[PDB]
Design a protein around this ligand. Structure first.
Ligand SMILES: OC[C@H]1O[C@@](CO)(O[C@H]2O[C@H](CO)[C@@H](O)[C@H](O)[C@H]2O)[C@@H](O)[C@@H]1O
Ligand SMILES: OC[C@H](O)c1ccc2ccccc2c1
Length: 443
């Protein structure tokens, strides 16, 4: 298979081939998922299920190897089924949550090479016979967040069937290579021309907003990515969810709008372009498919003349609607507007991305056979050296149906001080709070 458009996007953010094993085709560019498991576990059989999962999805066997400047995919035969198990200790709940977070951090702090199998690893942390945390980590070229939920769903299903516990049959998945074919086929349609023309004009003169770094690029400090984690307080999250319902906008639009307000106060800019990642899974043929589908999507909003936070949210809604309506794979949009990324590689600025995690919606614990499992979203333990961000700043929020929000601000430690970002995050939460408290107040 060829690289997908998303993997082509990542190539733009590659490190080149000069010494250091970093960036998105390096071993720190991974994604984790943690699930709380209730019920007795047969570790042997779970390990076998993990083998089944990797056999099932080609993307989890598709290494990427350096091939003269670029990266070549190669689908490999599944390697040995492997599972690490740790006894975390039979302790009180709050200590279980803590030791669980520490395990997640530890796993995310370790490398996982894309150049050879495995591309997925699993660590099971058992508290007692009937309570555990299951941690999956996958190279982020192979899996996005949605794909991690597919992997978990499949895994626990295949485990149950091996145990002889009744479970519904799994659908036959499409493979990511079939998606890769399809997106390229799709990108030759007449519709695409109209969309390229829409973008060429919409983004004329546009520059993704750059944030001034504390440490310049040319300092050459070693690449690292830190993650400051937070949960939106319940009263605040309720306010956001309620405001959004009444405004007829999504909670994402409201949070993004607050970010635009924050960038205005810090940069003075009124013409604000900020990329998000869309989920990139509008084609439901691929909902059972493991792969990384997400798509870099520039959102340009003109804030000039806004008389209130409500107006900001409404312009944002307009921007997102047209953006999703005309969405292109970014590696087929960027040629039309090549100066859009100027501040990305500048010596004293980096771009930021503001996203909502795209994941299957679940109300509460799920069941597969004799196990109950639920996803862990809220991590409050921050992390000094975790999953790689190729070259920038990432805001990432997961918005639960329940209304609760788990977020991260990730940044490169070779470019930003920890205290700078802590202040940035605190500013963001303060802007968000005043905004929804007083959405119609004048500026
Ligand atoms: O990103 C929101 C929220 O989700 C968690 C849950 O583990 O992290 C996921 O999203 C991060 C950003 O995309 C990834 O780096 C991470 O691998 C993935 O698990 C949080 O820790 C975060 O606050
Ligand atoms: O899930 C998105 C991923 O963490 C990512 C990939 C490329 C980026 C490029 C610039 C800034 C942030 C990025 C984040």
């Amino acid at each position: 298979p060829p690289l997908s458009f998303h993997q082509e996007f990542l190539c733009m953010f590659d490190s080149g081939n000069d010494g250091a094993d970093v960036g998105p085709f390096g071993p720190m560019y991974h994604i984790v998922g943690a699930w709380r498991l209730t019920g007795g576990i047969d570790e042997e059989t779970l390990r076998e299920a993990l083998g089944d999962v990797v056999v099932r999805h080609e993307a989890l066997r598709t290494s990427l190897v350096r091939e003269g400047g670029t990266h070549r995919p190669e689908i490999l035969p599944a390697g040995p089924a492997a599972l690490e198990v740790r006894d975390l200790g039979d302790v009180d709940e709050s200590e279980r949550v803590r030791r669980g977070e520490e395990l997640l951090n530890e796993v995310e702090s370790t490398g996982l090479s894309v150049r050879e199998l495995p591309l997925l690893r699993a660590v099971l942390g058992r508290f007692d016979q009937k309570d555990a945390v299951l941690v999956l980590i996958a190279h982020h070229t192979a899996a996005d967040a949605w794909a991690m939920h597919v992997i978990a769903r499949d895994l626990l299903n295949l485990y149950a069937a091996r145990r002889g516990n009744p479970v519904p049959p799994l659908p036959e998945p499409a493979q990511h290579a079939e998606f890769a074919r399809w997106e390229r086929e799709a990108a030759e349609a007449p519709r695409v021309a109209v969309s390229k023309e829409f973008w060429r004009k919409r983004l004329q003169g546009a520059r993704i907003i750059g944030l001034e770094t504390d440490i310049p690029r040319s300092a050459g400090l070693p690449k690292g990515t830190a993650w400051q984690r937070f949960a939106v307080r319940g009263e605040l999250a309720d306010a956001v969810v309620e405001f959004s319902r009444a405004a007829k906008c999504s909670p994402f639009m409201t949070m993004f709008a607050a970010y635009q307000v924050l960038l205005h106060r810090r940069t003075g800019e009124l013409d604000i372009t900020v990329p998000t990642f869309s989920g990139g899974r509008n084609n439901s043929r691929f909902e059972d498919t493991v792969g990384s589908f997400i798509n870099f999507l520039p959102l340009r909003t003109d804030l000039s003349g806004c008389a209130s936070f409500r107006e900001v949210v409404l312009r944002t809604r307009t921007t997102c609607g047209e953006a999703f309506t005309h969405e292109l794979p970014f590696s087929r949009l960027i040629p039309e507007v090549p100066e859009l990324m100027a501040s990305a590689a500048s010596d004293n600025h980096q771009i930021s991305v503001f996203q909502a995690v795209h994941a299957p919606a679940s109300e509460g614990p799920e069941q597969a056979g004799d196990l109950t499992y639920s996803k862990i979203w809220e991590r409050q333990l921050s992390q000094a050296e975790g999953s790689d961000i190729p070259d920038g700043v990432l805001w990432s929020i997961h918005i639960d149906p329940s209304g609760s929000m788990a977020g991260s601000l990730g940044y490169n430690t070779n470019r930003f001080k920890d205290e700078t970002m802590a202040a940035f995050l605190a500013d963001y939460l303060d802007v968000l709070e005043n905004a929804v408290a007083r959405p119609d107040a004048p500026f």
